[PDB]
Subunit: 257 residues, 5 copies
């Protein structure tokens, strides 16, 4: 519970570097990074999305050098990987007008990443409490009408990949003391992706007392969502498209009592 001094010297720092692949639904063997085409329910009550149509949170647990000392995460560099793929406007999309190029990926996006010393803590909130979330996903159980705004029963850990749908979970702001998270939802069928890349930007993960996430059990938890928008097919059907996210985290050894 008590945080003491940082250890210095040769052995005292380490670095984690990896990428998290997006989990958009992957409806067949050719469509890694895409969801199933989105269909609309016949009535509000009958909302019942298939699993392959639901983007999910990505998570990786990274083992750290075995070490009371704990690894403290201090800085992060992060980047969406493959932003230029959205320039492919020639692959059986929907022409914007007669003889025009294909409509590029656009519309509702969620870009989110977190670094923590334990699993990201989630709070469940649903657009429509009568939505039936599908077998194979982990979703708010015993949803009530109050779950449309806040039901404190819906607590969970982001402890599994391809499992927690993006639309029914958010980071729990009442918890997550040992995690730093950042996200933006940009909503609207025509919103343009705006994706920046650079290897010169660093986020500092230290809190107001100068303490970063402390890695319980010598594990680092990285989480992400990068739903870039929707690809529209020639027919007008639409699929979520996601991209991978790069993480580089620097850690240092911190003594605790």
């Amino acid at each position: 519970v008590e945080v003491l001094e940082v250890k210095t010297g040769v052995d005292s720092i380490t670095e984690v570097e990896c990428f998290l692949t997006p989990e958009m639904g992957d409806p067949d063997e050719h469509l890694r990074g895409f969801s199933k085409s989105i269909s609309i329910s016949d009535t509000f009550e009958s909302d019942s999305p298939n699993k392959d149509m639901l983007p999910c949170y990505s998570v990786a647990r990274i083992p750290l050098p075995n070490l009371i000392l704990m690894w403290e995460a201090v800085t992060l560099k992060t980047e969406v990987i493959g932003v230029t793929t959205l320039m492919n406007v020639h692959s059986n999309g929907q022409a914007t007008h007669d003889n025009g190029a294909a409509k590029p990926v656009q519309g509702t996006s969620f870009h989110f990443f977190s670094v923590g010393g334990e699993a990201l803590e989630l709070q469940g909130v649903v657009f429509n409490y009568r939505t039936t979330y599908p077998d194979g996903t982990i979703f708010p159980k015993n949803a009530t009408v109050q779950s449309q705004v806040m039901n404190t029963e819906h607590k969970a850990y982001l402890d599994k990949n391809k499992a927690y749908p993006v639309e029914c979970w958010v980071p729990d702001p009442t918890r997550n003391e040992n995690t730093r998270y950042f996200g933006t939802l940009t909503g609207g069928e025509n919103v343009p992706p705006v994706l920046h890349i650079t290897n010169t930007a660093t986020t500092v993960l230290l809190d107001e007392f100068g303490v970063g996430p402390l890695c319980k059990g010598d594990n680092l938890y990285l989480s992400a969502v990068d739903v870039c928008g929707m690809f529209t097919n020639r027919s007008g059907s639409q699929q979520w498209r996601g991209l991978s996210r790069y993480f580089k985290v620097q850690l240092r050894k911190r003594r605790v009592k």
Copy 2:
């Protein structure tokens, strides 16, 4: 007269809570939504029903009993459930043949305040002939001048689910003991832009280093988070709101 800050383990406290949105809640299935919006045929016949009108949210939070007063110093705040807006499959209006449903979008109002007493309101109406319904508190004796400024319309945000958003704003002539922040983004097609993080803190101290001072040991939190409108298959539209998280740090302050 504000004197010194108390120190010691006993001298700080924290409030953590959420305010649910008050969008109208037209039936047992529609918490967080308004009634579908209908348009009056004339200004004179504008008479919105209560469940069609988003209202201000407010909570009065009792603090440990204490001349000392609790002083609100910092705020962390967050809109809860931003990702619900990715549900584009729930009997909405397809954007084009075979496409996904139109997402929630259009006019938004995102607002929050922290004070040591009720938020002070000034009434202003789009149309003075609008008749606000029973069960709401609204500018009384509205005149055509109420469309721009009528100083008679003063109130306190002292009741949840009662003060309609569209006819009240924070009174800039008062609110010395409150800090408030809001943004109205208009237009039927404006995209929600909702940021979340647990790394952002707002300092509530004024230019003299003094934060809101909690009269009778009560903290007042207020919010509006109308995110936009949901469009049904039929084309009818309902406001959709989300809850707001507040975490406030307070310290004891001696006053004269």
Copy 3:
């Protein structure tokens, strides 16, 4: 004016707090804060807007406590647009955006402007179309020529009267106004969304690069504003400007001059 030292002590500071109502045209007894429906001229040459169709600059001259050499110096401003949430009334004789939808909200061209000075705001006249006939009861650029469409230095005036100076044919004169601080944004386009921020935590400092604010000649403070938020479209499709009031709070201190 040679500016010398600031006075201190309890008597040395004062504060002005008020609001300026918008002057959008007010075409009937039910339409305060709106203009008349906008009509388009048959030809460029025949442009001839009626008074109730033209938003005008707002101005207030606030007398300050008498001093006399001392002048009141305006140091800080807090300001806010009043009634931003009125724009959420999309249920009141508007035009549905699509079948069964809500009304189109106020949107399109906006001008948000405010100034604080120790004398009247100085104006330069510029016209979109020099053959526009501005109406009786307004004060407009006189003897307009084709050069008035870009810059004609004859068109100088003072913002010295309310409901009088149309917004479209006057701007702050950047060649003058040394004793005023002004700020404005024109956001064009027929569909631009209003973005209106409110807070009581923001202050603007009015001091120039030498540490001197507007000095109030004859102990009067001049506040000016325009807050055209956009156009309201009614059910027939006709459009009217909609404006809102602006709050001002200004802190002043006594400054000796020679």
Copy 4:
């Protein structure tokens, strides 16, 4: 030049204040500030714009008080687009946005540019379409080849004449202009809304990383501008560029050199 110390004393500073009028084409005696209606050629090969359809760079060479070794050094700039509120004239024979609506406001592609230098702005020619035939009375890239569509180093010029250098075929040469500070933004798209800010509280410092402003050769200051605000759409749907004048205020100090 070796740059040495700045002179002090009352005589050591001077100010320049002026405005540059826009040069949009001026197709007739009533249309100062506008271009001719814009037409579209059938092929790249057949592109042949009329002179009065082409906006041009504006330039003023301002003589300064005679010095001779001392040179005037430009230190600060205040600048403002003049007449931003003219864009609120949406009643002057424009095209209704929809039935009973107000006229479509000026919008679409804009270029806002200004520069301050101690010699003429240096230009590099680049063309959208090398087969464009530029008209008599303009100065344009000569001997254009297909490489001129991306970069042909033959097209060097000085902005040394008003109403002459079309905006679309010239830019500031980033390989030169050491003795000039320039700033510009092109915002494209047929529906981009103008966003025009005005204030008299904003100053740009013109000093480089070594603390040295433009040094005025022969005691002349060179000011250049373009303010294409967008296009005006007439009732018929024809479109014309609309520009506005730009105010400059420059502070200069005396600098010794060798």
Copy 5:
């Protein structure tokens, strides 16, 4: 082992150049444009022609022959010919009856890098069954995983007119000796926003005060400036690119 910077005469140098865009150049009159964009008949049959594919630009600049190494410290950069997008009078598609031509708009990628060796690339494809054309260098043995991340796709940007923009990005796992900056703005109607000035400088030093160190006395500059698409009268669309200016200041640094 990076040691001290040399000072004095001949201890600094400057590189100035421009990189032309490589958009495909489909004929002798269309330098700076791509071929008209065609849409494949099926997802599987995606097979873009070379002249339809913008590529990364690169230049290797020899430095004064020099252990000392040239260290890149600052960059000034600018897109050249921004005003060409005001040509809305040639061979375009009127935005409405009697209107000017639709200007260049839609998807853009603006990117630049400075390094002391070739930019390192990671391949990522929109569609793994896309057949990239002869004469381009593209991710080989692409699998479905290549749609998100296949670590087999590594390359150096070591050739002009060869690496298509759409299937390569800077590799964030490498490039320790390069500084790179890019923005993808997607959507068919996005307006170009192009700023020019000679007053902005980017500093190339890392968190330790060390800039790119130029191996073999070569400086590597890379760029893409796809500004958007030009629409012809027929509605067919072509990518349009512009050149990029670079000015880099370098100093001599001793190393062990």
